[model samples]
Target: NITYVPAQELLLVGKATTEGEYFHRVDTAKYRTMPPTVKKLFTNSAGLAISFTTNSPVIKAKWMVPDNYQLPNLTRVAQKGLDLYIKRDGKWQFAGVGIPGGVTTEKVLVDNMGTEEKECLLYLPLYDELKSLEIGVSSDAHIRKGENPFKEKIVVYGSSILQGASASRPGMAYPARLSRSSGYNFINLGLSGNGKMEKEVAEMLADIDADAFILDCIPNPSPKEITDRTVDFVMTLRQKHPDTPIIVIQTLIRETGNFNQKARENVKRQNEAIAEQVEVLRKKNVKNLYFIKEDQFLGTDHEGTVDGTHPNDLGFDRMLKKYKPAISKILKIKFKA
Candidate 1:
């Protein structure tokens, strides 16, 4: 007979605060800008990390999700893939993946862990709406909240792709990857189709004490919005936090751009406008501003996307490659392999 244990008895990381019994990755009041009808979408915990220390030989999880939830472009796994990782030699290593079998409460992540007590981290689902989660360890195993070493926090704001659209699991999201690589706390403010660079969201972001701010919402905004608001958005942050590093990223070219002339031109025009805005900021002597172009995101790989718009894990890997250098240069930190 297998005995089960409750996860909340152990340590949970990567959440702003716990509400009642559930852990919230994003602060419902401070981190969102969506209309009330769709506010629940931002509440679906993405990029949240659940951490603990255990010596249990077998580790298991039971969780719940809403019924009838599905996205046409994203896989059920990505939308609901719960990933687990273990710490070894100061690095977080992949352990196992949890597949939500259905909508009901059931054992979701079940795996055999090591005998010695080791630190562990579990990444929540990318897009699924989670109701509750509980981890199970061998009844006699030693378990507790694991120590988190990341001190400085990095805040990221962006669109659906940044919200972990088609990632194989939540850990594969580029921001999560960057957090693991650099050992920095990360706040994901990705709002799916709603990550427009609005002043309200910018104001909220300005309030966080972050080491750097990465802006990747270019794909969701219209050309007119980008042309009009890009300058003001940067200025708002700059005015509030003079020296905080700001990374302005151009939109990634859609895989469909290779064949569609309008698609290619649209990408070109948007990126050009962003580059011009960065130049304007520099002329104004705004220090610590960095830029990444569209071509640098995924190179020329038509295989980078799942549906020509959102990226698959492969594209996200390439994106990390491009982002690591720029981010490292701006923050003056080195990322681990």
Candidate 2:
């Protein structure tokens, strides 16, 4: 388990706008050349890799961190390629690299490791730095501190669409963008091809106590698959988090040449099936279950999808715009420019 504490004691660095440098000080092995110099850390519990991010300041674990737990060695892919390191006895040691590019720069410091049974972190640093660090962790780890600002929590389960497909930058990913815009913490459970919406996945999601959930797997799953499983899939999660808001989004209509009418019809039927399932939940007085329909799909015919399925930047903007009203109502979330 990783614990994150932004400075309650605010020290003005400069004219700070967002939560970045000057607001809180992170103890680094050294200074940062990047705006968001990332401290990507992890602890493996069982077979799952419990991962979290922190500003380089989590290095403060050296002085302010607890004693019983030692620093866990972590390496980020940076300085031309990925460099590796480990922490033992409160000291960080650079291990040999698996990359041929060799180590360009490495930061050595204490790792503030956590040992809770179910906790994770997603540290965000000031945007004042030059380079941005993107950390990817395998399954099993949980996000404790979650995303920046730490307002509300949103768990997104989807295919490549939710995995940041076709987005120009990491921030452009719909989940990330929505989270940032709405001041909510986002948990991206977007596996490239593996959102089967199976019971096991629902069980895993059930364990997480997010404020809301977004399911957008229709882009990748077959109509039969969605119709057969979507309701039960939602039911299982509802069993666990009865009151949590759940948004079931239709797979965005394709914006490309092979305009499959049959596929569209199938999607319509699947959505109707999901609606029936939602009625079941509604009958049981489920809290907030929403279905995003096709009319909600943003954009004119001209600027739909770049490759027909994955949303291009303009496509994402349009989708986000459409969602603004519904999400605001469902999650009571708000957003600005």
Candidate 3:
């Protein structure tokens, strides 16, 4: 297996960039108005994937992260890992995962496969910047850019939770999972702790001509910030994409709220604040404005989060289940399930 193919040459998905850095999410030059933290967070490969075709019975991956990033709330695989999916029966299916031991790691992601050609999507690290990546296959096996299976692009702008903070592996991030299952490209513009809905950030978001926009940044901003920033953010996006659907998702009920009365009240206030903004925008004649009025995006079991704040794979799955139908209804896209 001497063939090591550079992933940079493969078809990249879920990123919109004109920068020389293919892994970054946006045109950094245009978003200078954003805060320094948000600007830096754009380098994360949260929703990026490498699509390729190969018939190798065993698939191996080689990759490097910019740093040995660590997060207490997230598993190492979610922070610095790769997961593979193969197209089978016209649906994307989970295949294998590449776990990282350090800044650079290479190993077999899957084995015992047939020689028939397969379409594959390899999800990148969720919370780290990828310095480089390559796919290893048998010398005789062919590998090239696979077709983009997803439909129109939808931008999902939010906080660390949406950025795959506590996902078990890269592929399990709600946005990635939603993309694979929804048949639409849900671009993960999740800005970690920096998705504050700043005016400049909203203005920068307006520049993205996505098929739709999803604002789920409620967790990172203060309740005051939510009340203050909600208007211009939605209004600016509306001004840019007049009829493009813009969906606002309230934060999910955090497990911390169970005992912390203040935390519970805070969550309720933020949801109300978001609801207030949605009502205001609607009355102002903002076309195609959709709001997920319910706050129980997660289940009542409270077993879904890794931490009180970030959703684990189970929490993400619950979130995807609730979000898919509502989002598809808003955008009028056919539900995958």
Candidate 4:
């Protein structure tokens, strides 16, 4: 059997790129902007040794790989792929460097590593840089770590709302801001258009060492699907992780500004029917079971929506506010700051 440590060791590798006008939401960075031409990575807590590699001779390829030529963190660096390569001054060159964890002195290297090389290897110092670390190459940079002193792991499995496609800024997304504001480590599995109640994903969620699980896949699911699937998913997850609190975030009210009388009616019927079917557990008084009410989505004068489907920042905030108490209550944990 594997023994559990008080704090787990983590290493996160992800791109720090922006598309159109908004940055993509990545949970490791808390949706913050990553440095340009740099494949950014972060972690929940610092480990003893963390290393980064620039495998391709792409562009001005420093120890960092840029968004235009972001390198995939392959299980093993192959001979043919330039995933970490960069083109510099009309020629390709290999980048070799190492970053130590916990060191925050803004370490950087510029190399004319030529394309003739078979592979570029970067071995980063691991003594510092995980907490409140800043990394960048060009004029763009964002905080890799926030000022939040302590962080709790909050893993969320959901759909587009959690993905932040429609959110105004990287920081504006509820989960991103919540991590900053509440000082919690966040892992987002909110794949847009793919929130099917997959048993494999559910199993993955169960095996994780998280303080809580937030499930919000309702919008992507049909009413019939939810009615049929919610009980089994909830109960299975609960059985596997009896001690970890789970929060089922009901679908957000569509951005109609007003809950469609018809939609609301449908939702109410579904909620009622499902509650009845699952009433035995409630009556039996199963511990840690919960339901998040859907009253906060109803905006006065029809203003909670951005475009009749997705909620704007205002609506997301309302959802967050409503969720705050229940999450805190179920987890029996308080935000340190």
Candidate 5:
């Protein structure tokens, strides 16, 4: 026999906005002020997950996600299904995957487990909104919320790359992977084709009392938009968090730069444009603002992208190598690797 309990009954991570269900990344009501695209992207559980301790011999999940959800360059597991991890020797290890069967599906995530207590982490879908979720366990076994493994929050605001677009599973997103390794609550505010540094979106980010902020919104906005909005955007972040470290990452030099002339020039221009804006902010005496560039963002290899743009797991790993150290130094957190 098996017993099911609402996932909310466990420890929900990646939650902050006050107006939605247990899984929404942003407020449901705040949609009225956002662009149509951002309103929909806000519903995705990109970096959300649950933590629990269970004595069950078998582990399972029953959940619902928006039906017919699909992505061209992304996998279904990343878009609509769930991935799970377990704690071993004080580190998280991949355990199982919940394959989505339909709008509503039930499947065992793991089975034949030891009866002794074990800590588990269950990640939500990346590109889909969660409708409901229930964790299943052996009828006679016990299960409940586990202690939060993450600490002070840092917000990552940017594009589809930040949203986990091409990660094989939800938890493989750079921020999520970084969170597990670093023990910080790295919140995902990636808006996919919409992180244009709009006033409304800037206000929403300012609303969060984060310990630090990282902006990768460079790729989605054109050079003109980057020049027009970046100063104000940095200003917004500093207004709410005067001394908080605000790190701005330049766009990944897109892979298509190898063969596509216009694409290459566009990304170069975008990166250049952002550098100019960061300089402008610096000249204004904007303290604690750091501009990140000249890193092995995707490495020199052409194998880092799926569509010559979004990153694969290897690309994300390469990214971890570059961004993690700088981020740790700025945040005053020790780098694990």
Candidate 6:
């Protein structure tokens, strides 16, 4: 038989805004974490995960999402789907996804999770507001908060690609994937189209005591914006956390770069500007700063992306492979290849 338990008793990750059982990824205050002028940018509650340990042979969940919520190019799995991952040998592996369809309650995230006690991660909707969530396990099994071996935090700031725009499920997002591979807690500061290397956002990120910071906002800014804001914002962040490693990422050149000269030029200009900024900062004797090239992004294979821009699972996987080594070297952790 099966029994239900309140998810509140388990460990909930990726929330900066919460009041008791309620959770929101973005804070409620007008101008703190989110600027009051563009409040809607914070509405997408992407990259939040609920983790717990249970010995039940079966697992289940009941949750609610808003009505009529949709993103034109994204699927329900990415928009409102719930995904599951199980921990083994200090790593998280994909298990299954809840078939939410359009329904909002009693979705079986995974069933028959085996007869052993193991840690599990349940990723929340990437593009929708969650109304409520709960978990179900066998009546006699033990249930509690999941184990986190690596407790240090990795803070990421960037665009829709970082927000999981085209990932089939939340766990497929590169940061989530990186967290699984590296065993560190990751904070996703991806604000979709608004991740424009802004000074205000940099100021807010300065307060988080992170082990490393990944800055990937190159996708959202124009070439001029990159020239004007990238260095300044990076310097501002460095001012606050001089010792933490900051990884500057070049944007993934769009798939159209293969044929469109304009697209190629746009990507080339942005990347060159960012590379120049990194060189300037290095010349200024900035320490603990790293740069990842555009070629090292989602890989040169044109098939990795879904829409010319946002990566599908293939793209995210390719990107993760490149990210692991650099991030591992910076954080002084083993990159489990």
Specify the highest-lDDT model's number: 5
Name the runs in model 3 displaced over 4 angstroms: 18-20
Can you list the residue pairs that collide in candidate 1?
none
1-337 per-residue lDDT for model 1 (tens digits) = 3455555666666553344235555555655563552356566778777788788887777877777567888877667767888888878888877877788555535455558887888888778666777777777776677776565768888889888887877788877888889888766767788777877667766777777888998888777778788888988888789999998888888887889999888877878777877887889888888887765587665889888889898899898888888778877878886
Mark the 10 consecutive residues where model 1 has the least summed lDDT.
Answer: 15-24
TM-score of each: 0.91, 0.56, 0.96, 0.55, 0.98, 0.90
Among these predicted structures, which one has the highest TM-score?
A: 5
Lowest-sum lDDT 10-residue window in model 3: 15-24
> Model 4 segments beyond 4 Å from truth?
1-134, 137-150, 257-264, 277-286, 335-337
Worst 10 residues of 4 by lDDT: 73-82
Ranking by TM-score: 5, 3, 1, 6, 2, 4
List model 2 lDDT by residue over 193-247, tens digit each.
Answer: 4565776667656766677888877666665676677777888998889788889
What pairs collide in candidate 3? none
Task: Show how many residue pairs clash in every candidate, following the order shown.
Answer: 0, 16, 0, 33, 0, 0
Model 4 per-residue lDDT at 197 = 62
The local lDDT score (0 to 100) that residue 219 gets in candidate 6 is 85
lDDT of each: 0.76, 0.48, 0.85, 0.44, 0.89, 0.77
Candidate 5 vs candidate 6: which has greater TM-score?
5
Off by over 4 Å in 5: none
State which candidate, 1 or 4, has the greater TM-score: 1
RMSD (CA, Å), each prediction: 2.4, 15.4, 1.4, 15.3, 1.1, 2.6
RMSD of 1: 2.4
lDDT of 3 by residue, 1-337 (tens): 4589998778998885446477778766667778888888887889999999998888899888866549888878888889999999998899999989887898899988978999999999888888899998889888988888787789999999988888899888888888877688989999899888898888878877688899888888888888899888888887788888888888888888978999989988988888888888888988887888764666888888877878878888788878888877778776677
lDDT of 6 by residue, 1-337 (tens): 6677766778778654353234466554633655553345555557778889888877888877777558876888888878988888766788888767555667666776678888888888887777777888888887788754445778888888888988888777777777766667777778778888778777767767777788988888888888888778878888889898898988988887878889989988888888888887889888888888765567766887777888888888888777777777777876566
